[PDB]
Amino acid sequence: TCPFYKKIPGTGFTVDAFQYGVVEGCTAYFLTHFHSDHYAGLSKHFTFPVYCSEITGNLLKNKLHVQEQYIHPLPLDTECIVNGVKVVLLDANHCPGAVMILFYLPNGTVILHTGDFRADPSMERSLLADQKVHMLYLDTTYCSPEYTFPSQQEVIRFAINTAFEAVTLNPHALVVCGTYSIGKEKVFLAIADVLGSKVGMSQEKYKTLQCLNIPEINSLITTDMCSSLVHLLPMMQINFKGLQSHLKKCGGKYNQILAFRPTGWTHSNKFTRIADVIPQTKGNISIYGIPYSEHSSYLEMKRFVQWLKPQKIIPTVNVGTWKSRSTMEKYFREWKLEAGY
Numbered sequence: 001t002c003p004f005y006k007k008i009p010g011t012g013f014t015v016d017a018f019q020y021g022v023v024e025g026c027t028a029y030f031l032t033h034f035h036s037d038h039y040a041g042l043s044k045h046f047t048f049p050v051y052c053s054e055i056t057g058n059l060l061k062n063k064l065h066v067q068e069q070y071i072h073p074l075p076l077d078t079e080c081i082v083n084g085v086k087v088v089l090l091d092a093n094h095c096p097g098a099v100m101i102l103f104y105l106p107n108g109t110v111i112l113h114t115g116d117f118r119a120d121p122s123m124e125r126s127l128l129a130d131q132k133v134h135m136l137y138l139d140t141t142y143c144s145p146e147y148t149f150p151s152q153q154e155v156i157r158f159a160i161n162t163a164f165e166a167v168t169l170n171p172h173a174l175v176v177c178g179t180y181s182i183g184k185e186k187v188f189l190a191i192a193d194v195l196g197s198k199v200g201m202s203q204e205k206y207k208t209l210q211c212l213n214i215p216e217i218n219s220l221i222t223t224d225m226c227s228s229l230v231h232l233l234p235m236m237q238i239n240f241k242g243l244q245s246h247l248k249k250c251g252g253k254y255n256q257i258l259a260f261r262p263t264g265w266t267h268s269n270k271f272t273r274i275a276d277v278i279p280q281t282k283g284n285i286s287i288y289g290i291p292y293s294e295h296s297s298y299l300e301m302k303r304f305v306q307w308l309k310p311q312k313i314i315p316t317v318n319v320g321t322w323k324s325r326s327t328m329e330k331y332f333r334e335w336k337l338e339a340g341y
């Protein structure tokens with residue numbers, strides 16, 4: 001049944017709650033972003049109002065064929081009224097079109113639902129600065145102190161420098177980047193930019209990217225693989241077998257692959273700096289695992305929460321085990337006692 005952490009008290013609202021059939025008493029279904037664990041259950045047969053960002057609304061219409069009459073896109077940073085309740089959508093610094101949602105309940109309670117987010121100090125200057133938030137529904141994906149990772153900027157610098165060096169040393173090397181969802185477009189777009197290439201990809205992935213309102217996108221991507229030396233493939237194919245196979249398909253245009261797998265966290269983060277990352281190599285194929293995250297590190301999450309000073313926190317991630325739940329609640333209490341709220 002629908003878990004309590006997907007329901008907004010004092011409203012008929014749910015958040016990211018599309019796989020439970022008809023949720024009894026739900027008058028509006030919000031969708032924070034277009035990732036499958038969150039949209040699971042939507043299709044052209046859905047006949048209740050869906051509230052979301054413009055970009056998420058483009059993906060619902062074009063990829064899932066949800067009918068236009070049930071899609072209610074809202075502008076960001078704008079006070080809107082939904083079934084008699086004031087709401088605001090804020091940028092979540094996750095994937096394209098991902099939002100956080102502020103609810104202003106008729107009784108005076110204010111609730112922030114982060115959806116999935118990568119906390120950033122820039123959030124401390126949005127419409128959140130203007131009033132008190134009483135309850136926080138928090139993306140706790142990496143809520144433990146072992147989870148450190150570099151900035152997105154440092155990671156993209158590493159990838160750009162690595163790719164440019166490899167291809168300038170060998171003009172017959174191919175660059176391959178893995179993907180299995182929207183998000184992390186900077187990785188492949190920044191590499192293609194330094195190499196003076198467009199990124200080549202399947203028709204399905206090109207269609208997905210054409211929904212994202214990225215500026216000048218027609219100048220950066222293509223379905224013509226032969227004219228591109230940065231290829232995008234399914235994350236599944238980023239392994240030595242899958243890459244050897246792909247190289248056969250390019251007809252001796254290329255004699256080396258350099259491949260990137262933008263993982264979330266991996267335990268080489270506890271020891272190794274970004275400057276010091278090395279690939280796995282077999283023959284003329286090398287694979288780099290790079291820690292490009294679109295979720296908060298533990299320190300980024302802690303700074304956000306200690307700034308916001310919520311009265312109650314409701315985790316939305318890692319909630320399935322008692323040991324996880326208990327550990328998270330211990331961190332929340334530490335943070336509250338250190339900061340004095």
Ligand code: NI
Nearest residue numbers: 033035094116
């Ligand atoms: Ni997500």
